[PDB]
Each structure stands twice: as C-alpha cells, then as structure tokens.
Amino acid sequence: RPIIAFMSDLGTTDDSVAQCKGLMYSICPDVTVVDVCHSMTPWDVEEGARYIVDLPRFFPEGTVFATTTYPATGTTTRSVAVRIKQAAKGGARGQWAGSGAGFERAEGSYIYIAPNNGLLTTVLEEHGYLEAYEVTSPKVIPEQPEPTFYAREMVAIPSAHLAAGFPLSEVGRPLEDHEIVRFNRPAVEQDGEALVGVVSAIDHPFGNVWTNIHRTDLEKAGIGYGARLRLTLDGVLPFEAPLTPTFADAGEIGNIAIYLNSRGYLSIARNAASLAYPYHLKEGMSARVEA
Amino acid sequence: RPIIAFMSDLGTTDDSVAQCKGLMYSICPDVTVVDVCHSMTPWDVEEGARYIVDLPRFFPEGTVFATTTYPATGTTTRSVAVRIKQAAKGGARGQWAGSGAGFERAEGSYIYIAPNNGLLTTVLEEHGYLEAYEVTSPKVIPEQPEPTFYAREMVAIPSAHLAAGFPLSEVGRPLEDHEIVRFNRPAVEQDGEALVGVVSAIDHPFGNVWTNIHRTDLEKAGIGYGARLRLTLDGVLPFEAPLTPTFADAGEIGNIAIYLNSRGYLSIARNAASLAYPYHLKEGMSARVEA
Amino acid sequence: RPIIAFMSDLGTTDDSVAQCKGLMYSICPDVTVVDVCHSMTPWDVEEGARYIVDLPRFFPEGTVFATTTYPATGTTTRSVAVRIKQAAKGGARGQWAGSGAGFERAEGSYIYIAPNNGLLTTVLEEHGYLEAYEVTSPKVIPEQPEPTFYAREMVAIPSAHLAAGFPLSEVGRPLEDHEIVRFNRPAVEQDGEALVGVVSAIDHPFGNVWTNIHRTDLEKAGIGYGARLRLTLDGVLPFEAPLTPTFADAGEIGNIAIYLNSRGYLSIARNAASLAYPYHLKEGMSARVEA
Amino acid sequence: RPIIAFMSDLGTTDDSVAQCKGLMYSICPDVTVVDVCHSMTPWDVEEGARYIVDLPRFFPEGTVFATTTYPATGTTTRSVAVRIKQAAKGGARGQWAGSGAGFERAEGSYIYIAPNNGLLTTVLEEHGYLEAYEVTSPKVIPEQPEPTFYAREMVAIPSAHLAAGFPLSEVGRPLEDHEIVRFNRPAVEQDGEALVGVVSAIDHPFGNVWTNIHRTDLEKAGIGYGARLRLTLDGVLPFEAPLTPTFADAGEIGNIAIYLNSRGYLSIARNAASLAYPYHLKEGMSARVEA
Amino acid sequence: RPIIAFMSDLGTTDDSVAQCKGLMYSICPDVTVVDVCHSMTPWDVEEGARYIVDLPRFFPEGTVFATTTYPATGTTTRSVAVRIKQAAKGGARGQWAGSGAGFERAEGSYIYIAPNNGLLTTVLEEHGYLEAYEVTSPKVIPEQPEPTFYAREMVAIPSAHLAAGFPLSEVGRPLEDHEIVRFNRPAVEQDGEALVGVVSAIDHPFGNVWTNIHRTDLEKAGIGYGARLRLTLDGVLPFEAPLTPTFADAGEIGNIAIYLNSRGYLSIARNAASLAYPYHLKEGMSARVEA
Amino acid sequence: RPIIAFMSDLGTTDDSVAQCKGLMYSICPDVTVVDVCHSMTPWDVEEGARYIVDLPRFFPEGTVFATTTYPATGTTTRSVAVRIKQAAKGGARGQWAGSGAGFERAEGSYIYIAPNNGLLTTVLEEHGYLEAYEVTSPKVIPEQPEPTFYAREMVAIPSAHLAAGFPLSEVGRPLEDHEIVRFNRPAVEQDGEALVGVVSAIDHPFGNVWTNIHRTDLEKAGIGYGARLRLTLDGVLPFEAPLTPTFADAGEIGNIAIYLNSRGYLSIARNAASLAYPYHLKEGMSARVEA
Ligand SMILES: Nc1ncnc2c1ncn2[C@@H]1O[C@H](CF)[C@@H](O)[C@H]1O
Ligand SMILES: Nc1ncnc2c1ncn2[C@@H]1O[C@H](CF)[C@@H](O)[C@H]1O
Ligand SMILES: Nc1ncnc2c1ncn2[C@@H]1O[C@H](CF)[C@@H](O)[C@H]1O
Ligand SMILES: Nc1ncnc2c1ncn2[C@@H]1O[C@H](CF)[C@@H](O)[C@H]1O
Ligand SMILES: Nc1ncnc2c1ncn2[C@@H]1O[C@H](CF)[C@@H](O)[C@H]1O
Ligand SMILES: Nc1ncnc2c1ncn2[C@@H]1O[C@H](CF)[C@@H](O)[C@H]1O
Ligand code: MET
Ligand code: MET
Ligand code: MET
Ligand code: MET
Ligand code: MET
Ligand code: MET
C-alpha cells in the first residue's frame, strides 16, 4: 500500500498538484498520495524544510516523501533521492507517534526525493541517511522535462517510481555528502543567560508563535516546565509566563502561554486566541527568552 | 474499505493534517481519508459543528468522522466517540443524498470522534446517538499524548483505530448524556410574525448569506417557495425577494435570491454575484424573515 | 482503480467538496478522488477551463474529470458528459507527460462531466470528443436534485457512476455539437509585428504572469527561445528579456524572465521573486509582445 | 480684507498648496487664504464641482474662489475667471447662511477662477454669471508658467491678483458662454414613481451617503418630510425609513436616517454611525428611491 | 485681533469646514481662524475632548474655541458657551507655554462654544468655568438652522459672534452646572501597587502610545523619572523601561521609551520608531504601570 | 505682515500644530501662519527636506520657515536658525515664481529655523546661507522646554520670535558650517550612458513618480524635451516615452508621460491617471534613465 506524501510550493489554486498526482497514480496505480501541504512560501527552502522534517515517524514505513520547492527548475540541477536512517522521535518530549507507546519505525524506512537545493537539510540532520542518489535516470524522470515544472518532472514523477518499487540506487549516481546542498541553520545563540533565536514560524491558523529555540536549548540553559520566562519578540514586544506544557495552562482565554510546540520548540501563544495576528508578529522576528 | 472523514481547525498550511493522516494510514492501512475541511475558525465549536452535522448521509455506512477543534488540548479532557443513530435526511427538501431516490443509510452507521467540547452538539441533535464513550484507552490514544496536539492524539489516532474496526465500546467508559458537552444553540425567535435569527455563515467562496432560520422554522410560519419575503440583515437591509429554489430564479445576474440552501436553511444571495463580500456582510449579523 | 479528478468552485472552507466525495465513494467504492482544485473564481467558466484543459495526459486512462462551476444550478440545465478524443500532448514543447518519453494515452480514454455552460470549451477545442451526452438519467443524477448544489447532483454524483462503469451513452441523450455551450476564446491579435493578447492568469502562488499568447503564436512570428522580446503589460509596462526556457535563465534573483510556461504559453516572471504581486498585475490586463 | 477660498486636488502631503499660498500672500499681502479642501479625487471635475458650488453664500462678498483640478496643465488651455451672479440660497430648505435670517449676499459678489475644464459647471448653473474671461494676461499669470503646475500658475497666482483688486475684465478676453467648458450633469430619471439617481458622494468622515436626488426631485415626485421611503443603493442594498430632517430622527444610534443633507439632497445615513464604510458604499452606485 | 480655534469632526475632504470659516469671516471680518483639527472620530466626545482640553494656555487671551462633534444636530439641543476660569498649566511638568517662563494667561480669558453633549467635560474639569450659557439667541445662531449642520449653525456661527465681541451672557440663558452635559471620565484604578488605565490614544502620526495615567496619578505612587517601570498594554505586554523625559533617552533607535507626553500623561513609544503601528496597538487597550 | 510657513511631522490629527500656532500668534500677534504640510514621514529628514527646499521664491521676503521633524526632541540638541542667501529660481525651467516674469526675491530674505539634524541640508545646498545661529536664548525658547515637543519649543516658538522681529543673531551663538548637520545626498550615478538615481517621492495624491534625476543631470547627457527615453523603475520596469513638458503630452488618458516636475526633476506619470498607485511604486525604488 505505497504512500507518497507530497509537500510543495505549488499551491492549491490551480491544477499543478493534480498534474503531479495524476502522474503518481499513472506510475504507481496502487499509491496513496497524501498531501503534506502546498502552501509553503515559494523558494523558501528553510520554511519548506519545517514541513517535512518531522514527517517520517507518522508515516507507514516505505513512505516516499516528495518534497519540493524548485526555483532552479529547468536548470541542469537534478533532484536528490535519499533513504533516511532514523525515523526519529519528535514532539515536545521526543517520542514515537501513535497510540500506546507509539509506533516504532525501522531505520532506513523512508525516502525523500527533493530538489538538491537544501530543502532536505534538516531532514538529513535529524534523520541521517543511508544512501543518497542524484535523480537522473530516464526510467524515473522525463527525457524532456518541462523546464518550469521540475516539481513534477524531477520530484513527483520519480517519487512515484520509488513508491512503485523502482530501486532507489537506480535513479542515478550516488551522491557524496558534500554534493547534497545544505542551508546553514542559524544557531540559537547565548547572550548571557538568555537564549537568542528567531520566530521560526507563525503556526497558522492559530497565530501561535514558534521560535527556533529548542527544548534542548532550554535544557542547555536550565529551563524546564514551570520556569518563569521572559520571552521578548521582535526586540520590541515583551511577554512573560511560566513554561507550560499547553495553551490552557495559561488559565483565562487570551492569556499568554509559553510552551513547547508539537515539534519540540519554544513557542508562545495566547490561550485559545491568536497571538501573532493582532500584533502582526511574523517569522524572522527575533526571539529572546530569559528566565 | 474504511473511510475517515476528517474535519479540523488545523489548516492546510503546514504538515499538521499530514501527521494525522500518516497516523491514520499507519493504524488503518486500507483507510481512505477524506478531508472535510481544515479551515474552520479555530476554537469556534459552533462553526465547526456546521461542517460536520450534514455529513453522514453523504458517506458510506461505517464512515468515521474525525472532527476536531481542540482548544483544551493537553488538558485532562478526553474525546468522545459516539455512534450516531439516524444518518438523517437533509437539504432544502429533507431527502437522502445520491442519484435516484438517494442512498438510504442504516441507523447506527456512523461514528464521530471529537473533543468533548460541544463540537458534536448539532450532530447529536440532528442524528441522535446510540452510544457514546470517553476516549481513554491507550490502545487507541498515545500513553504520552503531545500536549498541544490532541487533534492528532485524541481524535486522528483513535479515529483510525475505530476505522480499523477497534470496538467503539472499548475506547473507554460509556458517557452519560449529561457528560457530553453541548453548546447552547441560539433559538430562532418570533418577533411578531417575523422570524429573527442570525447570519449563521457566509457561504464561501460565493459570498452567499446563510441564516440559522431553517426550512422547518419557515414551515412554522407557512413560508414556502413563492412567498414574497422581507429579509432584513444587520437590522437595516430589508431585502426583498420571493423565496425561490435557486439563485437563477432571481432573474438577471446580480439580482437578490432568497432561497433554502443545501443544508435546509433560509439564505440570501445574489444570482451569480457575491452578496456578502461587496457589503462586508458577516456571520453573526442579525437576520429577520417575514412574508 | 477508477479516478475522479474533481475541479470545482466549491472552495475548501466548508464540507461541500467532502459531500461530493462522500457520494463519489458511496457510488464508486473503489474510486480515488483526486482534487484538481476548488478555488477557481466562482462562475468564471473561462478560468475554470484553464484548470482542466491540460489534465488528461497526466492521468491514467479511464479517468473521469468532474469539473464544475454551476451558476445555473437548480435550473432545467443539465450537465454534459463527453468522452474526449486526443489526450493531447502539452507543455512548453508539446509532449506526453511522465518519465522517459512520457506516457502515451490512447484516444477516447477520458470523460469529462461538466455543466453545459462552456466550461469544457477548451477541453473540446484541444482534445476533440468522440461522444457527448446530456446527463439526465435518474440512474446517475438525483430524481430531486438539490436546487443550489448541481455541482454535487449533476457533476459529482454522475461522475462517480461513470467512474463506476455506468455506460456513458446511458446518462442521457446524445448532444449534437451545437448543443454543447462554448465560450468565445478571445483571439491573440496581430498589431503590426506585435502579438496582442491578455494576461490569462496570475500563476499563484508565485506571481508569474501567464498570457494567452501561445508558443504556436510565437513560432508563427519566428519567435523562439533566445529572441529578445518586449512584453508590455497593462499597456504601459514594456518588460524586456530574451525568451528563455526557465526562470533561472534570467540570471540574478528578481530578474525578469520571459518564458513559455508548462501549459505552452508566453509568460513573464521574475527569477525566484514574484512579478505580479508587488505590482498588483492581474488577469485580463493587456499583454503585447514583439521581437 | 480680501479672501481667497482655495479648493484644489493638490493634497496636503507636500508643499504644493503652500507654494500657491506663498504666491497669494506675495501678490495680495492683506489676503486671507481659506482652504476649502485639497483632497478632491484628482482630475474628477464633477467631484471638484461639489466642493465649490455652495460656497458663495457663506463667504464675505468679494471673495475669490480659486478652484482647481488641472489635468490639462501645461497645455494651451487657459483658466476662466467668472463673476457669478446670484450667491444663491442653499441647504435642505434653501436659505441665506448665517445667524438670524442669514446674510444676504449682493449679486455679482464672487469670482471663481478655475481651469476652463468644466469644474465650474454647477457653479455657473446654480449661480449664473455676469461676466467670464479667459485668464491670459501676463499681469496675472506667469509669462513662463510651470508646465505641470497650472493650479499655481493659472489659478492661485491670478486669483491673488483678483483678490488684490486686479480688474477682472483685464485678465484676458471675454469668454462667450459656449467657450466655457461644461460637464453634462447626469439627470435624476423617473422610472415609474421612483426617482433614479446615483450616490453623488460619501460624506466623509461620517460615511453618510449623498445622492444626486434633490429635494426638488422629491417635491417633483410628491415626497416631503415624513414620507416613508424605500431607498435602494447599488441595485443591491435596500434601506427603508421616513424622510426626516436629521440623523437623530432615526431614533436609536445606528438606525437608518433618510434625510436631506445640508446641500439640499436626498441622503441616507445611520444615526451617529457610519452607513457607507461598513458596507463599502461608494460614489457612483445607483440610488433608487421610491415611496 | 480675535482668534477662533476650531476643532470639529468635519474632516478636511470637503467644503464643510470652509463653510464654517466663510461664516466666521463674514461675522468677524478681522478674525484669525486657527484649525485645531477636524479629524477626530466622529461623535466620539471623549476623543474630541482630548484635542481641546490643553488648548487655552497656547492661545492669546480672548481666544474662542469653537469645538464640535454634533451627533444631536437638528434636534432641540442647543450649544453651550462657557468662559473658562483657569487657562491652566500643562505638559509633562505643568507649566505655562511659551518662551522664557511661559506666557501666563489671565483667568476667564477663553470661551468655548460646543454642543452641550459632554465635549467640554475635561475642559470644565481642568479649567473650571466662570459662566456658561445656552446658545439660543437668533443674534448668534440661524433662526432656521440647517438640521444636519449644527457644527456650523450652533458652533461656528455663534463662535464668530463671540469672537466679534458679542456679549457671552447674551447668547442665551445661563446654564446651571447640572445642565452642562458631562461624560464620565473612567478612573485610573489601583490594582495592588499597579496603576490601571487604558491607552487613551495612539499619538499619530508617530504611533506613540498614550495612557490616561497622568503625571499626577504617577505622583500618587511616587513614580518619577528614573523609576524602572513595567508597562503592560493589552494585558500581555509587560514593557519595561525607566520613566524618562523623552524618546532619545531609550538609547538606540527603536528602543522602548516610557515617558510623560506633552499633555502630562504616561506614554510609551519606541525611540524614533513607531510602537503602535507595527503591533496594531489601539486606543482603549488596557494599560498598567508599576515600579 | 510677517509669515511663518510651518512644515512639520506633527500631522493634523490632533491639536499639536494648533498648539504651535497658538504660540506663534501669541508671540507675533500680526503673523500669518501658513501650513506647508504636516504629514511628512516622521523622522525622515531627507523627505522633510523636499517639502521646504523650494519654498523661498514663493513667499514674501522676510518669511520665516519653521521646519521640523525632531526625533532628538528633549535632548541637548538645539535648533539652527539660518538666513539663507539666494531665494533661488526653480521649476522645470529654473525661474522666479509668480505672474509676469516672476517675483525676484532679494538675497538674505528668508530665515529657516529647524532642528539641527540635517533637515536643512538641501535648503543650504540650494540657497546658501549668510548666517546661522544655534537657537538657545530663553528669549526665544522655553526655559523648561517640553521634552517630547521640541517642534513647538525649539522651532515654532522661536520662529514666531523671529517673525516678530527678534534679531536673528540674538537667538544664540553663531554656528560654524561644520556644526550644521547635513545628510548625504545620494548622487545620481552614470552607469554607461544611463543616469541612475532613485524614486525620490511619489507625488501624492496623483501617484506621479519623481526621481532625483535633475534637469541639470539630463542636459548634461544631452537630454532635453523630445528625447525618447527609457526610464526603468525598481530595476524591472522600462517605461518608454519622450521627455515632454507635461502630462497631457502623453496623448490618451493613462498614457505614460515622462516629464520634468515643478521642482525640476525627471518624473514619470500617466496622463490623468495614477502611475504609482496601481503598481504600488514607492519612494526609494531605483530609477534609471537613458536616451
Ligand atoms: N518565478 C519563479 N522563479 C523560480 N522558480 C519558480 C518561479 N515560479 C515557480 N517556480 C518554481 O517552479 C517549481 C515547479 F517546478 C515550482 O514549485 C516553483 O518553486
Ligand atoms: N493557541 C491555542 N490555544 C488553544 N488551543 C490551541 C491553540 N493553538 C492550537 N490549539 C489547538 O491545538 C489543537 C491540536 F490538538 C488544534 O486543533 C487547536 O484547536
Ligand atoms: N450566488 C450564486 N449564484 C449562482 N450560482 C451560485 C451561487 N452560489 C453558488 N452557486 C453555484 O452553486 C454551485 C453548486 F451547484 C456552486 O458550484 C456554485 O457555482
Ligand atoms: N498625472 C497627471 N496627469 C494630469 N494632470 C496631473 C497629473 N498629476 C497632477 N496633475 C494636475 O496638475 C495640476 C497642477 F497644475 C494638479 O492640480 C493636478 O490636477
Ligand atoms: N450620520 C450622522 N449621525 C449623527 N450625526 C452626524 C452624522 N453625520 C454627521 N453628523 C454630525 O453633523 C455635524 C454637523 F452639524 C457633524 O459635525 C457631525 O458630528
Ligand atoms: N517615538 C518618537 N521618537 C522620537 N521622536 C519622536 C517620537 N514621536 C514624536 N517624536 C518627535 O517629537 C517631535 C516634537 F518635538 C515630533 O515632531 C516628532 O518628530
Ligand atoms: C499546537 S496545535 C497542533 C498543530 C500545530 N500546527 C502543530 O504542528 O503543532
Ligand atoms: C452554494 S452551492 C453548494 C456549496 C455550498 N457551500 C453549500 O453547502 O450549499
Ligand atoms: C510555475 S511552476 C509549475 C506550477 C505552475 N502553476 C504551472 O502550472 O506551470
Ligand atoms: C451633515 S453634517 C454637516 C457637514 C457635512 N459634510 C455637510 O456638508 O453637510
Ligand atoms: C509626540 S511630539 C508632540 C506632538 C504630540 N502629538 C503631542 O501632543 O505631544
Ligand atoms: C503634480 S502637479 C503640482 C503639484 C505637485 N505635487 C508638484 O509639486 O509639482
């Protein structure tokens, strides 16, 4: 029962994703295409990375992640197809996903195929990989790929072959690690006792604010649940609350919750109210937290 | 061929829905996950209710409706899983859905799993239920649920177990009726001969205006198709049109149509033009109807 | 493994599409419903046409395209169901879609079912058709169709019967060609040496500008890749670039690329930057091009 | 104590009006410059006309109205300077302005100087004129006028000479009536008993809606204060109220007032609430009124 | 050399203010009309109050303040004309305005004429009054006032008579104190050691945030310059800065300054950046201060 | 008859300017205060400079320009008061302003008083100065100036003393040239034959685009009226038109006019249509021009 989980910047306002899906069903008749999302900021490889990094543990083993923003479409660039190593635990706590104790996933159980443009940076960081290949075989990509639609040609199409059981090592030549493009992930710096990062994302549609300050950055600073925090956003907007597991811990609706999100990072929200929207808080604003 | 029809407030801009779906396929490999919608106003249980109440008759019997906005995520709250009684006719007329005379649906043929937060108020109102259980079993929910992600932990996960044939009564303790949280559904009042309600929704993306004045409410006044109505929105807009079956009955494009929507409610629109958008009409504005 | 590819104006903000899908799975238990998109401008038949015309070559043979904007919902109008002739090559170059040399699609391999309101004009233009029928049989549509929901009653539902193998010729009487409503496709005019058309679409979410000036119109002017072009939008913006295969050919990020999009049309973008959005360029603006 | 009352489209965001004023004080040291307004929609001669037509009765005799939108600036066009005849009563009732019984103004007591572009159409209609001259004398305009600033050169400057006592007949040659450009003022038509006009203006900053239906159009239709009116706006938005002298007559705050504005025209408003803004009502929308 | 300082809600987008001014010059030929502002929120008497309360010390003795938002226009209501008592010091410090030690203003040296709608509440509070009269005499108001234009009829006109030396006591009957309408000025409450008020205004066009926590309120807590304050806006923004005299005291551009504004009120801003606009801070949001 | 022409960033939404005016009339009873404008972008000294540099030739000799954006308000900074040298011709052509051959202005005839923050940079550049003084004397500024209102304390107030005939040299110590803060005026660069500058301003309310490319820069390139120009905005919009004196020279309404504005600068507009607004063109965008 092959799955392709499909994350793109293609949007859902035209038939672009459907073209890809048509081809996925063409190539892998029995496939299930799962949309991850298609609304990532176009060409923002770091943002795209966020939508795909945590996926493996939730998916059945053998799932192929077709993940693409492809601003280098139509160039001599070729996608990378990698088998990841650890499906990797996640969340505020770091666990296997699912009922009971969760579902453990065997190593080497997921393939990502993406533009070799750094999209997979954090996937590779968090999961490691067992093998990586340049996607060049005309068995898995068009001989004449549409210049402006490498998302389809060099990701959707070959992901469907991979889902169909096309041997990964046959999509093209092995890539050495240095040949896998990566983006530099900005460090959470320590400025005194304070951890200084950025708003990594606004958690739509809630307006929760996610920072790139991980629980590990917090552990590394001696802050666990219950710790009274000052979280300053945008070097202007100050917030103060204990670190709590969840939103309702803030008490009243609208109260500030500082918490660890489901991806494991320091975040801030109002309890059942949007924090980000009324204040127009945005991804990329500084996030400083201090006890 | 089990189906989970999934309605959440999770949006489609990140991988949150995909995480739930990954887990649904993990748990119930042969499941078809049908998106209901994921764009509901977060935490607005009355709005969420509107997207799920009409669903059963459309779906094959045995469908599980995983329906969730979960502001109380991470609290001691637990979801409720209910087997509804009547699949219930619907529409302007009140009929089975489908070709011919429609597909009659057996009773007790659908399960809803939702936060016990009132989301299912109108589902229970319109369909009744045969049994309801608190969702507590570690067989169907994580032993260590992600605090901020009960949509996944307490709805998506257990829904897939239910879709996989996990016995409903084994999800947890039977809930007594009074233990099923309900929201108060504001009544359509009679102010003289006029029926007084609200705009229940703007019917996106058309900008049609839906009221909570149901066909049955109109029948209480003997208002049927052909009746020349004054529909006053926001207190000051005495729209006038006969009640007609459809938009084109208004005649010229842009003409006011007063009609019964597909959910059976008194609605107002322009014929092949947006009524609500140009004039910024909104849910919650008063609506009054009379002949 | 039947597929219904479903393109509507229903949006994805409520359960409307899900109701259609529920019925599609009810009627055709084995079906895979692939969303094309549901965000088309309501009632804009010409725009809806763009999202469906290029679909066939992407999909497995036997796919049914349920394509609908239905402003005449509730009227005596009835859908048209057509078996197209040529799946037809497409793209900047004009080729079969897929890996290798692409997937050749047999003739007569796809059915569209749509309102008979011109939605299928370009489908018919580009693919031809072998047979067209009015969709009237209560075997494939409701006896009492919901007045305001013909998208479901007269498209979704019968599309699922067609997917389920209901004989096309049994949906109703054959339509003669003149009975299939067409919209007039505005011609690309020659104004001297310049080809004059319109911005056909803003390519969301990138803000690329698509014109209705086809590759064929360009190679009729001796315009091929490498030609230095002046492309004037909205009658005042005389962008200049060579015609290149792709965005990155513009060089620096933000530079103007004039290219043939994946649908084969003269288009203009910035390289990995939005062209349309900063300047609020829009569909329907004039588009002039000269070598 | 000479007054120039100055109405332009120059805005108040830069020093444009100040340049004009500087010159007015240069030429007429003892002048008082009164700003009428400078925010009229640029080049909208009909809208500009509204801001100047009612002015004379409020001003001391001898006031010069410098009134300008000048889209033909820098052309061979020359301003017209006219001495009006009747200062003319105004208002909902038609009276002299001021305390007691008002201040009667002698005939021939005001000069307008404006581009000869129709700006003065309604001034001439409502007031008549005694003499009109083309403004060409280098005694009153620059020998080398700034091409893009005829508002200054051909209106502000010569208005200051006129205020200073420069003989009007000496600014240039007499204009025959046909040489005074006029705009066609759209008629309030009778469609049955209903009077059909347009929203002439949104009365900022209140959001009151003014129509071009005059009390005389209403008198001519048998509607005076107390008459129950239906006023339909934009051929969509319907309103109903008696014709009342004022806003507070509507009763509750927010209630619909249909009234005659201070310029004498049928208008509609909410009582101490904005009508136009929440509904995005605009100038140019149809205004149909019926009893 | 009489001055009328004119504050209305009339806006500057049409000729309404000019009509009033024309009449002011008609009645008092030698008057200087000073615009205070005309952009106040219509009908918001508390906001209007803020624009007029601080005016007297700035103006030459004998200045008439014509101050008006007149929602009760056209009713039996009549304006009030008051001679204030103390011109009153002001500012962060509480001082006479002007160079050197400032211009001391005699008592009883200013008249306000306003609707008797509470607009003068804070004027009377902060300045006291010596006499107050209802404005009823046809010597100073129209015998037939334009119903919808009492700003002109009952304020502008009589103000000019007052400016011309019309005896104040002759405008009409003396009003007893209780006959002068007042609005309730919400108190700055003490919630522990914190002072709890509201954002009284956004200081346009800078986006500074003004509170109704006056210097005198801070003095009640012994809060002076240098005190490290927590200023919480909207309930969740614990701004922290010392109370400083000015913006630049915050140091770097964009740093938070907590200060006493020129009206003497606790305020918060960024240094040479907008505080309110980026975060959409608004009048009426809660404000709390403590050391 | 002294004049103070007052340009500030104070806006016109509150009584701030009126307070300044009150004091100006207090200090200089005979003065006429002419508003230049009060809407300049706060703290933008370069933009403020544009509104004041061209003023002198328009005003009667002896005019005082009180020009202020004062982000250093409340600091030890003190205003500069300068007597300029040349009133200087201006416009597209470079001429005295006024009727006939214009009004020649004697040298040393105008005083500017401003924060010493570079606001006067272009004033000094274009007019030169004869004398400059630091404004420190308590005869012309408050002994205890309001910390946050130096616009009033250090500009308005002393400007009125200067208007009143207070000797300029007595306001404080002479400033040496190096003590008068200047901003760096970005140069118009030559990039080949093309002149490269910036959009200096959007000319509101018309949406004309002004560049910092001066007539002098054009006639140094042999560019005069009639020259066919390519003017590229924002690095992507290569508008083409001949250089013409005025907007109407573009022909049809909406056509592109490239012209020299009234300040003498290369500008681009549409003929009686907004260029800047539809395309959201902005100050600071690159502006390139070539013959
Ligand atoms: N203007 C664009 N520049 C660079 N890449 C673009 C642009 N528009 C779309 N794309 C990319 O094309 C990929 C299809 F293969 C899409 O997913 C975009 O990332
Ligand atoms: N800020 C929030 N406050 C309360 N609940 C929230 C917030 N943000 C998201 N949620 C809920 O978390 C659920 C996942 F379990 C989402 O569906 C939200 O309803
Ligand atoms: N206001 C409307 N006028 C005409 N058609 C409409 C309107 N709103 C929705 N529709 C059509 O109803 C169809 C379902 F049958 C939707 O797909 C809309 O096209
Ligand atoms: N783009 C423009 N086209 C035509 N007229 C314009 C344009 N911009 C400004 N103006 C007119 O110039 C007059 C100055 F004399 C202004 O008052 C505008 O009406
Ligand atoms: N819609 C309105 N309701 C009540 N008062 C209003 C309305 N529009 C304007 N006004 C008042 O009329 C006054 C002139 F006398 C204006 O200053 C408004 O306050
Ligand atoms: N937030 C502010 N930072 C620095 N200066 C400011 C701020 N708000 C207002 N100002 C200046 O105060 C001056 C009056 F003296 C105003 O003109 C602003 O320039
Ligand atoms: C915190 S609510 C759960 C969904 C959310 N978008 C997340 O990924 O964590
Ligand atoms: C308005 S046509 C059908 C779709 C609509 N949202 C409905 O539920 O009735
Ligand atoms: C612009 S890159 C590919 C997606 C685009 N919407 C297309 O149809 O070609
Ligand atoms: C109706 S309130 C008075 C001012 C308004 N703008 C008018 O001209 O009538
Ligand atoms: C903010 S600087 C001075 C102007 C301000 N609006 C005030 O009244 O204090
Ligand atoms: C654009 S026409 C005249 C007004 C313009 N703001 C200028 O300074 O030239």
Side-chain angles (χ1 to χ4, degrees), chain B residues 191-204:
Chain B
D191 288 1
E193 288 206 323
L195 304 164
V196 179
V198 294
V199 177
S200 59
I202 301 308
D203 184 27
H204 302 305

Side-chain angles (χ1 to χ4, degrees), chain A residues 10 14 16 148-149, chain C residues 203-204 206 208 210 247 261-263:
Chain A
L10 293 170
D14 77 354
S16 288
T148 58
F149 209 168
Chain C
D203 179 28
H204 312 292
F206 315 111
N208 302 327
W210 290 354
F247 313 101
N261 63 22
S262 78
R263 327 307 183 92

Side-chain angles (χ1 to χ4, degrees), chain A residues 230 233-240 254-256 270 275 277-281 285, chain E residues 230-231 233-240 254-256 270 275 278-281 285:
Chain A
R230 188 191 201 207
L233 290 186
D234 212 28
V236 188
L237 282 200
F239 301 90
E240 273 172 3
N255 283 7
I256 293 301
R270 293 178 174 266
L275 178 57
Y277 308 143
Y279 297 143
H280 287 64
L281 297 170
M285 295 185 166
Chain E
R230 181 187 214 272
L231 178 46
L233 302 179
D234 201 29
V236 300
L237 306 173
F239 284 98
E240 284 159 20
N255 278 12
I256 288 302
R270 297 206 283 152
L275 173 56
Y279 316 110
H280 287 61
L281 307 180
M285 276 173 168

Side-chain angles (χ1 to χ4, degrees), chain C residues 41 48 51 55 76 79 90 117 132 138 149 169 197 228 232 245 261 264 286 291:
Chain C
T41 302
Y51 304 126
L55 294 178
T76 46
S79 290
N117 67 2
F149 210 164
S169 63
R228 282 179 297 113
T232 318
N261 63 22
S286 62

Side-chain angles (χ1 to χ4, degrees), chain E residues 179-193:
Chain E
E179 293 180 293
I180 297 152
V181 173
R182 284 153 165 88
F183 61 71
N184 185 39
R185 194 176 45 78
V188 171
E189 299 101 30
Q190 299 193 8
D191 288 1
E193 288 206 323

Side-chain angles (χ1 to χ4, degrees), chain A residues 140-157:
Chain A
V140 304
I141 58 168
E143 280 153 14
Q144 305 195 342
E146 192 67 41
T148 58
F149 209 168
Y150 274 20
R152 185 182 72 204
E153 313 293 65
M154 308 304 208
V155 178
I157 287 158

